[PDB]
Amino acid sequence: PVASLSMQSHFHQRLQDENRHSAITRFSRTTNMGVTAMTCGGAFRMLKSGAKFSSPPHHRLNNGSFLVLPNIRVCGATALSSPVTVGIPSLTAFFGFVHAFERNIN
RNA sequence: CUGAUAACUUCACGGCGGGCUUGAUGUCCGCGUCUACCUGGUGAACUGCCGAGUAGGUAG
């Protein structure tokens, strides 16, 4: 994966006046990254999650092969999923967690 | 077969000094609660005797 600096420009110069939807992520050698990380030097506005997470009630109820895995706890997974978003990790990492699990049973 | 593989942010700290919320006040007038009601122990634990005895005892 690489980072398109048209999407880095587009998300920056449209999110510079709303603060409920933007999280600032800094870097320390702005000159080596190129002029895009020098003009807005350091800042990098990128699409915060939107609100604090809310936990409603789960369900309101009364072949096959369905396996469960209850309450996995993760300590310190990264949130910078795309180069432009911040929040829940990329769901291709939830895919790799499954496919590295099905190769262990095989 | 996971923006893959590995990863110590740390050390130090005095928020302080002073202070008048006050003055005045009419909640009032009127008022019909009422009519009717089954709780059901059959005979069933009976009769003496001592003691002055509404105490006490004692018989089959």
Short mmCIF file of C-alpha atoms (C1' of nucleotides) in Angstrom, two decimals:
data_model
loop_
_atom_site.label_atom_id
_atom_site.label_comp_id
_atom_site.label_asym_id
_atom_site.label_seq_id
_atom_site.Cartn_x
_atom_site.Cartn_y
_atom_site.Cartn_z
CA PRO A 1 0.00 0.00 0.00
CA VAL A 2 1.09 3.54 -0.87
CA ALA A 3 -0.33 6.96 -0.02
CA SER A 4 -1.87 9.14 -2.71
CA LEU A 5 -1.09 12.78 -2.01
CA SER A 6 -4.17 13.95 -3.85
CA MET A 7 -6.34 12.43 -1.12
CA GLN A 8 -3.97 13.88 1.47
CA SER A 9 -4.41 17.31 -0.08
CA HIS A 10 -8.17 16.94 -0.53
CA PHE A 11 -8.93 15.87 3.02
CA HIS A 12 -6.66 18.56 4.48
CA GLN A 13 -7.99 21.66 2.67
CA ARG A 14 -11.63 20.71 3.33
CA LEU A 15 -11.41 19.76 7.04
CA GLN A 16 -9.56 22.81 8.41
CA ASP A 17 -12.60 24.39 10.07
CA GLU A 18 -14.55 21.52 11.65
CA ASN A 19 -13.17 20.08 14.87
CA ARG A 20 -15.61 17.28 15.70
CA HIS A 21 -14.29 15.38 12.67
CA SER A 22 -10.55 16.03 12.55
CA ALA A 23 -7.54 14.73 14.50
CA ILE A 24 -4.09 16.29 14.12
CA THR A 25 -1.13 13.95 13.50
CA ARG A 26 2.35 15.49 13.51
CA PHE A 27 5.75 14.48 12.12
CA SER A 28 9.23 15.79 12.90
CA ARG A 29 11.22 16.05 9.63
CA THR A 30 8.84 17.85 7.31
CA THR A 31 11.46 18.75 4.68
CA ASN A 32 12.36 15.15 3.83
CA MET A 33 8.73 14.14 3.22
CA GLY A 34 8.31 16.65 0.38
CA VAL A 35 6.59 19.98 -0.06
CA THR A 36 3.13 18.64 0.80
CA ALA A 37 4.17 17.87 4.38
CA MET A 38 6.10 21.17 4.47
CA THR A 39 3.39 23.58 3.33
CA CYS A 40 0.96 22.43 6.04
CA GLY A 41 4.04 21.53 8.04
CA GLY A 42 3.39 18.69 10.44
CA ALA A 43 -0.39 19.11 10.77
CA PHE A 44 -2.18 16.43 8.63
CA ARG A 45 -5.88 16.79 9.40
CA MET A 46 -7.37 13.29 9.08
CA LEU A 47 -10.99 12.34 9.75
CA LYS A 48 -11.53 11.61 13.46
CA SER A 49 -14.07 8.93 14.45
CA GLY A 50 -16.92 11.40 15.00
CA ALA A 51 -18.09 10.72 18.55
CA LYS A 52 -17.16 8.74 21.64
CA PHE A 53 -18.15 5.09 21.26
CA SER A 54 -21.64 4.14 22.41
CA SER A 55 -22.70 0.72 23.70
CA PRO A 56 -26.42 -0.03 23.28
CA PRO A 57 -28.08 -3.30 24.31
CA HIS A 58 -26.88 -6.03 22.02
CA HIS A 59 -29.93 -7.96 20.80
CA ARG A 60 -33.57 -7.90 21.82
CA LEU A 61 -34.77 -11.45 21.17
CA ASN A 62 -37.12 -13.71 23.13
CA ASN A 63 -25.35 -27.24 6.95
CA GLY A 64 -24.52 -25.13 10.00
CA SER A 65 -21.00 -25.02 11.50
CA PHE A 66 -21.11 -21.80 13.55
CA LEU A 67 -18.12 -21.37 15.88
CA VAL A 68 -17.87 -18.64 18.52
CA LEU A 69 -14.91 -16.81 20.06
CA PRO A 70 -15.97 -14.72 23.07
CA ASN A 71 -14.55 -11.32 24.15
CA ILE A 72 -11.08 -11.14 22.61
CA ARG A 73 -9.19 -8.25 24.24
CA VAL A 74 -6.59 -6.34 22.20
CA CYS A 75 -3.83 -4.28 23.85
CA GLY A 76 -2.44 -1.47 21.72
CA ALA A 77 -3.48 -2.04 18.12
CA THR A 78 -2.87 0.82 15.71
CA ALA A 79 -5.68 3.06 14.47
CA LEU A 80 -4.06 4.80 11.47
CA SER A 81 -5.74 2.34 9.12
CA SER A 82 -5.68 4.25 5.84
CA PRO A 83 -3.30 7.20 5.32
CA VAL A 84 -6.34 9.51 5.78
CA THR A 85 -8.54 7.99 8.53
CA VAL A 86 -8.33 7.45 12.30
CA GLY A 87 -10.55 5.13 14.33
CA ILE A 88 -11.42 1.43 14.18
CA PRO A 89 -8.66 -0.52 12.33
CA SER A 90 -8.94 -1.64 8.72
CA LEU A 91 -11.20 -4.63 8.24
CA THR A 92 -8.60 -6.32 6.06
CA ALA A 93 -6.83 -6.85 9.39
CA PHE A 94 -9.94 -8.61 10.68
CA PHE A 95 -9.65 -10.74 7.55
CA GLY A 96 -6.01 -11.66 8.14
CA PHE A 97 -6.77 -12.59 11.75
CA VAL A 98 -9.24 -15.16 10.43
CA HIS A 99 -7.15 -16.52 7.56
CA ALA A 100 -4.09 -16.99 9.78
CA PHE A 101 -6.39 -18.85 12.17
CA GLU A 102 -7.78 -21.24 9.57
CA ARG A 103 -4.27 -22.12 8.39
CA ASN A 104 -3.33 -23.15 11.94
CA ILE A 105 -6.15 -25.70 12.15
CA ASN A 106 -5.36 -27.01 8.64
"C1'" C B 1 -0.99 -15.60 6.26
"C1'" U B 2 -3.15 -8.90 9.37
"C1'" G B 3 0.09 -0.40 6.18
"C1'" A B 4 3.50 -7.34 7.55
"C1'" U B 5 8.18 -8.83 11.03
"C1'" A B 6 10.98 -5.80 16.24
"C1'" A B 7 9.87 -1.39 19.95
"C1'" C B 8 10.41 1.61 28.07
"C1'" U B 9 9.01 8.99 26.98
"C1'" U B 10 11.24 10.46 31.51
"C1'" C B 11 13.36 13.40 35.74
"C1'" A B 12 11.81 18.62 39.24
"C1'" C B 13 7.47 22.13 41.38
"C1'" G B 14 3.53 27.16 47.48
"C1'" G B 15 -1.88 30.76 43.81
"C1'" C B 16 -2.35 34.33 46.92
"C1'" G B 17 -4.00 39.18 49.77
"C1'" G B 18 -9.19 42.42 51.35
"C1'" G B 19 -15.06 42.81 51.58
"C1'" C B 20 -22.73 44.91 55.23
"C1'" U B 21 -28.02 42.76 49.94
"C1'" U B 22 -31.39 45.95 51.37
"C1'" G B 23 -36.36 48.89 52.36
"C1'" A B 24 -42.57 48.00 51.97
"C1'" U B 25 -47.00 44.24 51.86
"C1'" G B 26 -55.04 41.69 53.95
"C1'" U B 27 -56.12 35.56 49.52
"C1'" C B 28 -60.99 35.71 49.69
"C1'" C B 29 -66.60 34.83 48.97
"C1'" G B 30 -70.55 29.58 48.53
"C1'" C B 31 -71.47 24.03 49.63
"C1'" G B 32 -76.57 17.35 52.05
"C1'" U B 33 -72.46 11.85 50.05
"C1'" C B 34 -76.17 7.99 50.25
"C1'" U B 35 -79.50 3.46 49.63
"C1'" A B 36 -79.46 -2.84 50.77
"C1'" C B 37 -76.69 -7.26 53.81
"C1'" C B 38 -77.27 -14.86 58.17
"C1'" U B 39 -70.56 -16.46 58.96
"C1'" G B 40 -72.75 -22.13 59.66
"C1'" G B 41 -69.92 -25.44 67.75
"C1'" U B 42 -76.18 -31.04 66.29
"C1'" G B 43 -75.14 -35.00 70.89
"C1'" A B 44 -70.28 -33.94 71.62
"C1'" A B 45 -64.46 -33.51 77.52
"C1'" C B 46 -69.24 -37.15 81.55
"C1'" U B 47 -69.45 -38.60 87.92
"C1'" G B 48 -67.09 -38.80 92.50
"C1'" C B 49 -63.37 -38.08 96.93
"C1'" C B 50 -60.04 -35.19 100.80
"C1'" G B 51 -59.48 -30.14 102.43
"C1'" A B 52 -62.75 -24.40 106.08
"C1'" G B 53 -61.24 -22.85 100.38
"C1'" U B 54 -63.48 -19.18 93.40
"C1'" A B 55 -56.22 -22.06 96.71
"C1'" G B 56 -54.84 -26.93 96.58
"C1'" G B 57 -54.96 -32.02 95.91
"C1'" U B 58 -57.00 -37.16 94.66
"C1'" A B 59 -60.20 -41.21 91.44
"C1'" G B 60 -62.37 -44.86 86.71
#
